[PDB]
């Protein structure tokens, strides 16, 4: 069937069954396509083909990202390659022939086994050994000497290594996705250079590598049944040429570091909070595990502390302490960092107790009133509301970590605190109470930094950290929504 708005034609499942005879391939390998056809038709694989202009126009109408491979140097040669969309099981071809169509069916089917094996699934015992054998060869593939090979062979090897090592040395992509992509590129290099290496070449180390990988794929493709003898053509010079599309969930460090430097009038433009948020990333966010977070019930001990600390953060803002969207995120993140540390080390908050008790001796309701002699009864009500929360009456244990977190972010409370007298025991240091409170906060986080930087698996704290990363992930996505909701010069909803 042909599209109405473009010359692109669409081929669906159960429409290329007769194509086994059309290729008139040898009968021994002809039965293979009968099995490949069943597999791809089970998961609704459709084929789209056309001229380079027709297939490009189709993508724009349907909002499809294309991966056609061609350059100005290749334009002089004049060869175009399509791509495969592994997310929705669609194959895109550009000016296909009978050979290329057959080559793609056995290429898409092969990549499915690689994906399943590296996703933790189960495969056939024959396929498991073939992939494992191929994996071991790749380790020695990147350690050969090419000084004795033909100049045209060196260029092929140079390109393969650069793309292979990029997937292995990638940190912002899911390792399961990156591992499969690296192996798939390895097979393409071996099949491409089979023709030019079998002739006009010596018996170098690289040459023997090409012959071994070709046999390794043969066992994987044919399974446990008998395969054609050595040196036989696979599918009339089989080749892998189409690119694959793969996507996965981003990591926690990716989204948390994006909104660190957000600032706006409707969002908040406090400079001291942005700098405080930067030191948090160095101590906590940088040392989280690179794997994407999950969603489990996570019943434990630290998980009770994070749930309790989340409720107190909301309760504080509802009882006198209004905050902007920028202040709210930093308040939530810092408090959860101190809450998980206090649940592991019972003596982490020993110093904060001394500073909290001293502050409570010199605090009064009149400190929270702009006009000490006002007449409106509502002015006194709000000031008394803030006094109770500091006194802990409103909040009614993880109460201490919340106070330490609040003392670093709020700007109105810090003005009152800094005017209080300094104890004679702490007069040697020469610092005000507000800076003493902010210096005690970094001490708690620094102790937690050493905990995550050691042997996590043996210390049995891996599960606890997985709970802290979920809280950071949730608070990072919330400030990504308030931002972009005021993305106008006036900052109005």
């Amino acid at each position: 069937r042909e599209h109405k708005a473009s010359g692109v034609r669409i081929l669906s499942a159960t429409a290329i069954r007769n194509l086994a005879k059309i290729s008139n391939l040898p009968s021994t390998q002809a039965a293979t396509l009968a099995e490949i056809q069943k597999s791809l038709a089970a998961k609704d694989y459709k084929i789209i083909y056309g001229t380079p202009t027709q297939v490009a126009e189709y993508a724009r109408q349907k909002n499809v990202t294309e991966l056609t491979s061609q350059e100005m140097e290749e334009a002089q040669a004049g060869n175009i390659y399509g791509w495969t969309n592994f997310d929705d099981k669609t194959i895109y071809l550009v000016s296909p022939s009978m050979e290329t169509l057959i080559h793609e069916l056995v290429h898409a089917s092969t990549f499915e086994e690689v994906y399943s094996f590296y996703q933790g699934n189960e495969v056939s015992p024959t396929s498991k050994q073939a992939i494992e054998n191929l994996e071991g060869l790749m380790e020695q593939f990147r350690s050969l000497d090419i000084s004795k090979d033909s100049p045209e062979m060196r260029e092929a090897y140079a390109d393969a290594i650069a793309t292979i090592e990029g997937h292995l040395s990638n940190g912002f992509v899911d390792p399961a996705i990156s591992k499969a992509a690296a192996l798939n590129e390895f097979m393409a290099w071996g099949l491409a250079n089979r023709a030019l290496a079998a002739k006009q070449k010596r018996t170098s180390s690289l040459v023997q590598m090409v012959k071994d990988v070709y046999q390794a794929i043969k066992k994987l493709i044919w399974g446990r049944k008998q395969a054609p003898a050595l040196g036989e053509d696979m599918f009339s010079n089989l080749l892998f040429n189409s690119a694959i599309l793969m996507r996965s969930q981003p990591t926690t460090q990716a989204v948390a570091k994006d909104g660190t430097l957000f600032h706006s009038k409707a969002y908040g433009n406090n400079e001291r909070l942005s700098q405080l948020n930067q030191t948090f990333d160095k101590l906590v966010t940088d040392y989280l595990r690179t794997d994407p977070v999950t969603e489990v019930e996570r019943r434990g001990n630290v998980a009770n502390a994070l749930m309790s600390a989340t409720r107190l953060v909301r309760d504080v803002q509802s009882h006198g302490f209004n905050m902007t969207a920028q202040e709210q995120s930093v308040f939530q993140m810092v408090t959860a960092a101190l809450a998980t540390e206090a649940a592991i080390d019972p003596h982490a908050m020993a110093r904060a107790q001394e500073l909290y008790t001293h502050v409570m001796k010199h605090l009064t309701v009149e400190h929270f009133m702009a006009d000490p002699d006002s007449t409106n009864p509502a002015d006194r009500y709000y000031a008394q509301q803030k006094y109770d929360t500091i006194s802990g009456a409103n909040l009614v244990t993880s109460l201490l970590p919340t106070f330490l977190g609040l003392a670093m972010v709020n700007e109105e409370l810090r003005s009152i605190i800094k005017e209080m007298p300094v104890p004679k025991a702490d007069k040697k240091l020469g610092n005000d109470i507000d800076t003493l409170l902010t210096n005690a906060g970094t001490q708690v986080m620094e102790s937690l930094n050493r905990r995550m930087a050691g042997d996590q698996k043996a210390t049995n704290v891996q599960d606890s950290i997985d709970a802290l990363s979920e809280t950071i992930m949730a608070a990072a996505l919330k400030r990504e929504s308030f931002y972009d909701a005021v993305a106008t010069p006036t900052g109005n909803f």
Partner: protein
């Protein structure tokens, strides 16, 4: 400074200082602010003059004028509050009086002088210095408040019901962007198990009314759905902070409103003994001095949490920019009346017998509830209609009027009270329809009548599936409410959706053999035996298609725009009615690291699950156009080409509008909210041309999904939680059964 702007807001704005310009020059007013002794001297001479006129009623006049000055500054509400000097002059609710006890203008001057003394000593000192060193700036600012006052007085004096109820010294004030404060019942709020609200107090109420325990709940800064906060969202003009014609308050927040006749008389004699409580009730007074309603006030202390802004310069710009908008909406209603007269003129000219199908709106009305709403109609539109037609004349087509009143057969309650819901008969009809169209499993997790959605999911993978079925369900239910409001009978849809579902279902199954029979035709290039079998098969199927009741939509091509664009085997689940299981199959194709992220999982536009939702959405539009086309042909008597003309103007192709939001953000539910918004704009524009009577009625007769905010605490609808990504609700009980409004001109501008 920001403190000086707030002092000017309280001084010039909340004290109604513009009333002094009637008897004093601009230079004399600046002398009052610079001398406290002058203020005390003016009061002494004013009190003596009023005492002579008032006579024995001097004690009551003094008491009520001091109580009013308390509310205008500190926000406190006393017992039997009188909102303006016009009501104080008649002493409503105190003694039977046949006129003004004293001079109205004299009482106005005394009230604003009393409230000037209630200001803070520090606040008054700021105004004294500004009045002496900023002479040219202060005089210009005072003149602006005079212009703002005249416009409100022009609208208020038109009707006597709104003349005795408008608030004195009203000036707008805005909350903080992001916060929310509501008053809700304790028992009903507990079962929702919301995790974004914190109880900050209890609602005591008054002793004249008995009700369940209530409380205050506050929500800190977050992101809210568009067009739900920051605007008044009112379709009626307001003068003095109250609605024009009725007198109900709209510029502030109240906990409720009582309007029933038997219940109001119960409150009236209960308060004659005495009142006690932190939140007394405020009465609404008639033109003859009686009481027609009561309201539940709000504690002034609870308003401190909202972090309200009182910038004088900024709030004046908001005030004038809102008066202009109200004027434009008033002129639009006058043009609609001109069109209604033009249609009536031609029909009578063609033949004198055409008058048999017209009804006089302003004449005698048999329906009591309809008649009462006509009396409280805006006085500015009444005079315009009388100018063109005559003395108490307004003729409209009877057939077009019946459509505008098709809602009342399915809804019960009162809009002003705030308890307007669908009748139980209506719910049992819509509920059974969604089960048939969607899957049985989907109905159990979407319209649970006892439990919310979030309480029924206990797996990280099931969150993705549940969050995907919601979008088609919202679109399916929104269309049913919209077409019910436009006068389509309920019983028509109940018996037609299963009929249309069956007709569509067999189309794909029949098309499946035709869509690939051409491949056999290509392989039939040979003996005629293959050709003979194929030729009879394809022609027989097409003849069956010709007999289907939905055939005219097929020929136009809009019914099969995406049907032939792609054929897949799993799509048969959608046509069968297994949407919930169809979502699980596409969910398992996601990567392992994405499926286990639950509510944190970001779904890309390239995945198969993303395009599965789009296919289901257009499958709901499959049935929407089918029902509408029958309605315009069967019971409307329109040509087969006229009906297809209207259908094409109310639906759009979604492939042209991909999301344009940030990465690393959950924009799945937000994208569909904006797509559904544009389709609502096209519907409103079509209703104006094809039904001028319904548009005019929608802003006169109260109806569900016809009036916006009525002063009660903000309530959401089904379209609101869809955009916010929450899951603490259900579309089967209580909240979540509400549909967005249907006012044509309101949707065009808001």
């Amino acid at each position: 400074t920001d403190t000086e702007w707030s002092a000017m807001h309280t001084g010039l704005g909340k004290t109604d200082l513009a009333v002094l310009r009637e008897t004093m020059s601009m230079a004399e007013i600046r002398d009052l602010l610079s001398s406290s002794k002058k203020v005390k001297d003016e009061i002494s001479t004013l009190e003596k003059e009023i005492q002579n006129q008032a006579g024995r009623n001097w004690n009551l006049v003094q008491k009520k004028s001091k109580q009013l000055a308390q509310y205008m500054i500190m926000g406190e509400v006393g017992n039997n509050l009188l909102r303006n000097a016009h009501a104080i002059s008649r002493l409503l609710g105190e003694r039977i009086t046949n006129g003004p006890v004293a001079d109205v203008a004299a009482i106005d001057k005394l009230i604003t002088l009393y409230s000037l003394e209630l200001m803070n000593k520090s606040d008054r000192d700021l105004l004294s210095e500004l009045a002496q060193s900023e002479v040219e700036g202060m005089e210009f600012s005072i003149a602006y408040m005079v212009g703002q006052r005249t416009e409100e007085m022009r609208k208020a004096k038109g009707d006597n019901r709104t003349l005795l109820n408008h608030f004195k010294g009203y000036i707008p004030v805005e909350n903080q962007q992001g916060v929310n404060l509501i008053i809700a019942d304790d028992k009903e709020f507990a079962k929702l198990n919301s995790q974004s609200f914190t109880r900050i107090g209890t609602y005591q109420g008054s002793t004249g009314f008995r009700t369940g325990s209530k409380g205050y709940y506050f929500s800190p800064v977050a992101a809210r759905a568009p067009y739900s906060q920051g605007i008044l969202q009112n379709v009626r003009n307001t003068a003095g902070g109250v609605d024009i014609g009725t007198g109900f308050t709209l510029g502030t927040m109240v906990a409720g409103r009582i309007t029933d006749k038997p219940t109001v008389e119960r409150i009236t004699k209960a308060l004659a003994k005495g009142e006690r409580g932190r939140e007394p009730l405020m009465p609404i007074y008639n033109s003859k001095g009686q009481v027609v309603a009561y309201e539940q006030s709000v504690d002034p202390n609870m308003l401190k949490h909202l972090n309200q802004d009182n910038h004088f310069a900024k709030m004046v710009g908001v005030w004038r920019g809102r008066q202009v908008e109200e004027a434009k909406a008033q002129r639009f209603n006058d043009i609609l009346i001109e069109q209604l007269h033009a249609m009536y003129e031609k029909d009578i000219k063609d033949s004198s017998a055409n008058k048999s199908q017209y009804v006089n709106l302003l004449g005698k009305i048999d329906d009591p509830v309809l008649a009462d709403a006509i009396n409280l109609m805006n006085i500015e539109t009444r005079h315009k209609a009388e100018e063109l037609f005559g003395k108490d004349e307004l003729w409209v087509r009877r057939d077009m009027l019946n459509d505008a009143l098709g809602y009342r057969a399915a809804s019960i309650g009162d809009v002003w009270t705030g308890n307007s819901r669908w009748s139980p008969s209506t719910l049992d009809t819509v509920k059974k329809m969604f089960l048939g169209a969607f899957g049985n499993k989907a109905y159990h997790v979407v319209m649970n009548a006892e439990n919310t959605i979030q309480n029924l999911v206990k797996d990280a993978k099931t969150v993705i599936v549940v969050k995907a079925v919601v979008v088609p369900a919202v679109n399916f239910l929104a269309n049913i409410y919209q077409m019910i409001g436009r006068g389509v009978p309920v019983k028509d849809i109940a018996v037609n959706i299963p009929r249309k579902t069956s007709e569509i279902n067999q189309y794909i199954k029949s098309r499946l053999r035709q869509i690939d029979a051409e491949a056999e035709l290509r392989a039939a290039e040979g003996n005629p035996n293959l050709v003979r079998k194929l030729k009879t098969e394809i022609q027989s199927i097409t003849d069956s298609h010709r007999r289907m009741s939905i055939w005219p939509l097929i020929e136009a091509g809009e019914f099969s725009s995406i049907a032939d664009a792609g054929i897949s085997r799993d799509d048969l689940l959608v046509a069968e009615g297994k949407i919930h299981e169809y979502m699980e199959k596409l969910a398992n194709k996601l990567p392992e690291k994405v499926r286990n992220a639950g509510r944190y999982a970001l779904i890309a536009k390239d995945t198969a699950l993303f395009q599965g939702i789009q296919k289901t959405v257009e499958y709901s539009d499959f049935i929407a156009k089918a029902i509408i086309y029958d309605d315009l042909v069967k019971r409307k008597k329109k040509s087969s080409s006229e009906a297809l003309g209207q259908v094409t103007e109310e639906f759009i192709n979604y492939d042209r509008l991909p999301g344009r939001f940030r990465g690393y953000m959950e924009s799945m539910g937000l994208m569909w909210f904006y797509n559904f918004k544009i389709r609502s704009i096209k519907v409103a524009m079509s209703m104006i041309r094809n039904n001028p009577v319904h548009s005019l009625i929608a802003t006169v007769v109260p109806a569900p999904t016809m009036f916006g905010n009525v002063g009660l605490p903000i309530q959401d609808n089904m379209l609101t939680m869809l955009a916010e990504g929450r899951l603490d609700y259900s579309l089967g009980f209580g909240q979540g059964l509400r549909a967005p409004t249907l006012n044509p001109w309101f949707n065009l501008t808001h």
